[PDB]
Amino acid sequence: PTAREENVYMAKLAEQAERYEEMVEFMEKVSNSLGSEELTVEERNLLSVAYKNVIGARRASWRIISSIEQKEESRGNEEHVNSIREYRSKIENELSKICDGILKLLDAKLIPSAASGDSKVFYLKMKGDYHRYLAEFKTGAERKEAAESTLTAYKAAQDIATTELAPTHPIRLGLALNFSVFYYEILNSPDRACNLAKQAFDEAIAELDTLGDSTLIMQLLRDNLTLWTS
């Protein structure tokens, strides 16, 4: 009853207990203990759910603290603004560290281990996602480079996806969903956003109608598309 095996079981107890930081740790043990083989679909999804929950809690706090700093800076209340920004820096710091940890793991182990179109697009989309979270709060030269790394990763993901995966594939559909959110929200370019989202939705519709979760993601492209045409 192996180390890999027991770490995966612990990661799943951590997921039930909602101790996501521990879940991340157990899955990195798994991931750093692999030779030439890659993570199973189950293991990869466990690592991804762990990081997503560790980063989402901080993104949720960052939005809250940021909406407050803006209301308060708008009433010209300077002492509260310093207190709020200092709180926000603390949070941005945890966001940089969390991203740094999954981005290093992607470049060092995951991406080099990706042997099929499914896993390649999965890890490249992930790489695009964490550089994008860095861009949501960064501001200058830092924002420009996070935005550039984002665009580069999504494009590499889309090249593979477009040619090796079905348009109804959830990973390809999720890539299109996140890539178009990037155009809309980081690049403030609503037109490239709508175009990319609609093309992916249509191609999926086309395939479903001729060749036969992909359902949930498509509802999400539609929800974003209408949200944006407003």
Binding site: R63, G174, L177, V181, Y184, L220, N224
Partner: peptide
């Protein structure tokens, strides 16, 4: 904020 997965 838009939906992502």
């Amino acid at each position: 904020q838009s939906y992502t997965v």
